[PDB]
Design an enzyme around this catalytic site. Sequence first.
Site, mmCIF file in Angstrom:
data_model
loop_
_atom_site.group_PDB
_atom_site.id
_atom_site.type_symbol
_atom_site.label_atom_id
_atom_site.label_comp_id
_atom_site.label_asym_id
_atom_site.label_seq_id
_atom_site.Cartn_x
_atom_site.Cartn_y
_atom_site.Cartn_z
ATOM 1 N N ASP A 15 1.139 -1.233 0.055
ATOM 2 C CA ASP A 15 -0.159 0.051 0.052
ATOM 3 C C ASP A 15 0.736 1.289 0.121
ATOM 4 O O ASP A 15 2.050 1.324 0.156
ATOM 5 C CB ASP A 15 -1.043 0.077 1.266
ATOM 6 C CG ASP A 15 -1.905 1.283 1.371
ATOM 7 O OD1 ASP A 15 -2.374 1.395 0.315
ATOM 8 O OD2 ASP A 15 -2.023 1.527 2.514
ATOM 9 N N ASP A 17 -0.384 4.933 1.056
ATOM 10 C CA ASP A 17 -0.861 6.005 2.155
ATOM 11 C C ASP A 17 -0.592 5.073 3.356
ATOM 12 O O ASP A 17 -1.707 4.146 3.490
ATOM 13 C CB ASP A 17 -2.387 6.608 1.866
ATOM 14 C CG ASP A 17 -2.082 7.411 0.846
ATOM 15 O OD1 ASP A 17 -1.095 8.450 0.636
ATOM 16 O OD2 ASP A 17 -2.935 7.264 0.215
ATOM 17 N N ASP A 150 -1.918 -0.735 5.721
ATOM 18 C CA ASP A 150 -2.272 -0.266 7.332
ATOM 19 C C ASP A 150 -3.715 -0.383 7.570
ATOM 20 O O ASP A 150 -4.250 0.017 8.779
ATOM 21 C CB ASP A 150 -1.638 1.157 7.220
ATOM 22 C CG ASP A 150 -2.375 1.953 6.748
ATOM 23 O OD1 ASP A 150 -2.552 1.888 5.250
ATOM 24 O OD2 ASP A 150 -2.715 3.184 7.050
HETATM 25 O O1 2O2 Z 1 -5.917 6.085 6.104
HETATM 26 C C1 2O2 Z 1 -6.799 6.855 5.480
HETATM 27 N N1 2O2 Z 1 -7.386 7.731 6.198
HETATM 28 C C2 2O2 Z 1 -8.188 8.630 5.701
HETATM 29 O O2 2O2 Z 1 -9.028 9.325 6.612
HETATM 30 N N2 2O2 Z 1 -8.350 8.843 4.583
HETATM 31 C C3 2O2 Z 1 -9.309 9.900 4.064
HETATM 32 C C4 2O2 Z 1 -9.041 10.148 2.445
HETATM 33 C C5 2O2 Z 1 -10.369 9.813 1.797
HETATM 34 O O3 2O2 Z 1 -10.413 8.595 1.203
HETATM 35 C C6 2O2 Z 1 -11.524 7.815 1.069
HETATM 36 C C7 2O2 Z 1 -10.898 6.350 0.514
HETATM 37 C C8 2O2 Z 1 -11.905 5.417 0.653
HETATM 38 C C9 2O2 Z 1 -11.482 4.216 0.252
HETATM 39 C C10 2O2 Z 1 -10.435 4.011 -0.163
HETATM 40 C C11 2O2 Z 1 -9.279 5.300 -0.463
HETATM 41 C C12 2O2 Z 1 -9.823 6.479 -0.091
HETATM 42 P P1 2O2 Z 1 -12.779 8.855 -0.517
HETATM 43 O O4 2O2 Z 1 -11.773 8.503 -1.742
HETATM 44 O O5 2O2 Z 1 -13.951 7.885 -0.380
HETATM 45 O O6 2O2 Z 1 -12.822 10.477 0.100
HETATM 46 O O7 2O2 Z 1 -12.189 7.874 1.941
HETATM 47 C C13 2O2 Z 1 -12.503 9.081 2.750
HETATM 48 C C14 2O2 Z 1 -11.441 9.832 2.924
HETATM 49 O O8 2O2 Z 1 -10.582 9.468 4.171
HETATM 50 C C15 2O2 Z 1 -7.668 7.965 3.628
HETATM 51 C C16 2O2 Z 1 -6.789 7.113 4.113
HETATM 52 C C17 2O2 Z 1 -6.098 5.943 3.529
HETATM 53 C C18 2O2 Z 1 -6.581 5.138 2.182
HETATM 54 P P2 2O2 Z 1 -5.753 4.086 1.507
HETATM 55 O O9 2O2 Z 1 -4.066 3.833 2.039
HETATM 56 O O10 2O2 Z 1 -5.322 4.655 0.032
HETATM 57 O O11 2O2 Z 1 -6.114 2.850 1.455
HETATM 58 MG MG MG Z 2 -3.029 2.924 3.669
#
Ligand code: 2O2
Ligand code: MG
Lengths: 201, 201
Positions: A15, A17, A150
């Site tokens: 991954d 982020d 994560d």
């Molecule tokens: O850990 C996180 N914490 C977090 O609060 N977010 C934020 C950013 C934004 O991402 C989303 C999101 C949901 C699912 C996958 C990726 C992003 P959206 O695209 O729906 O706005 O969900 C709400 C938001 O939350 C993202 C992440 C990380 C997503 P990943 O590492 O790409 O899986």
């Molecule tokens: Mg992540």
Amino acid sequence: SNAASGGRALRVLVDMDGVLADFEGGFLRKFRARFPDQPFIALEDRRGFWVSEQYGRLRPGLSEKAISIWESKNFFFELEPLPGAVEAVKEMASLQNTDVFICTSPIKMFKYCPYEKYAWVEKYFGPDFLEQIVLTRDKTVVSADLLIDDRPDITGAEPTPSWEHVLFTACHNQHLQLQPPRRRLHSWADDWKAILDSKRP
Amino acid sequence: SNAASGGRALRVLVDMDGVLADFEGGFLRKFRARFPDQPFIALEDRRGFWVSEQYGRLRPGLSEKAISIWESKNFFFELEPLPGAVEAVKEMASLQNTDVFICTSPIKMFKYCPYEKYAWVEKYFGPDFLEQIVLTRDKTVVSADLLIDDRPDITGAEPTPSWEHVLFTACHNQHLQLQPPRRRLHSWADDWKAILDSKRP
Ligand SMILES: O=c1[nH]c(=O)n([C@H]2C[C@H]3O[C@](c4ccccc4)(P(=O)(O)O)OC[C@H]3O2)cc1/C=C/P(=O)(O)O
Ligand SMILES: [Mg+2]
Ligand SMILES: O=c1[nH]c(=O)n([C@H]2C[C@H]3O[C@](c4ccccc4)(P(=O)(O)O)OC[C@H]3O2)cc1/C=C/P(=O)(O)O
Ligand SMILES: [Mg+2]
């Protein structure tokens, strides 16, 4: 490095982020800079995967302010790598019979995020590593031996993914008790090679 | 539509360029407009997957001029849908126990292409369909029942992909004899439902 033709390398999904890129630290830095009169959540105090949900409980309106941070231009591009992350993935990709893909989800607001993720990988891993990127909102349809991520609960259209999910420690998950035999990678300083080797023939 | 929880929907991967989006027609239109004093290749005369290779044989320098077309801003975004493609994929995605992903490779020059592909899907399929996009340079690591793709030879890190590759007819592949039991979808007017149904339990 790829297997010799027709052969089968161990395949590891990593991954971005919270694993390679410091989303939580980047978020908090930019949030405090943009909204210096608002309360914030120290990383030590982060609970739950979703930043905006915790912020929304802290004060009304703060969920929308949080969201505005990751929707801004350069938010993803300017994330700093986690300690050890670039070095580990470079080493991992150089290992015999080891295929590494960076498997990441873009946010729904697509104006900047996908572009900046490709730019970030170019920056830290070089042009040839762009071949290893998979962008998806569903990791369960990507087949591999391991997924280092994560997020505690990874779900999607495939009910029985082929990978073992190894939970990468983050502020938001560090206290979570996992169901045996689920395991963790604490950081890139932790022994990721032992985890990979455990999945080899 | 997704299966009820824990269940298993038929999973179909659909390529974008040459399947949903008219890359060949868009290319030729913009090439002729930008380079009206150069010779060009009518679609009827297209041979080989790689446009720039055929152009490079036609006159020296033309490979680089061809490449400049797909590297330009708005090239991907302005591609027209293939006839029937939007309607077919909308219908397909509405079918019970049928999960459709648009599985496409961005070009190496990432400045515009990934963004414009997400924008194009939003435009034709709506915001909620962005959840169905997978960007990858390796389709063999994406697990599914079917892959509908105009490229004849699809290879990558997985030597035994789970999908059956159904070749979508395009100008560049229409004369190709395939090894039995490989099959084709001639166009979106062809009977794609029969192909899907052949893979169901
Ligand atoms: O850990 C996180 N914490 C977090 O609060 N977010 C934020 C950013 C934004 O991402 C989303 C999101 C949901 C699912 C996958 C990726 C992003 P959206 O695209 O729906 O706005 O969900 C709400 C938001 O939350 C993202 C992440 C990380 C997503 P990943 O590492 O790409 O899986
Ligand atoms: Mg992540
Ligand atoms: O059919 C095609 N014909 C074609 O000439 N091209 C052009 C565009 C550009 O694409 C690439 C390409 C190679 C592999 C996968 C996607 C694109 P590059 O990213 O390496 O520049 O290969 C050379 C170039 O060829 C792409 C395609 C379509 C690719 P797909 O539908 O995304 O698999
Ligand atoms: Mg194609």
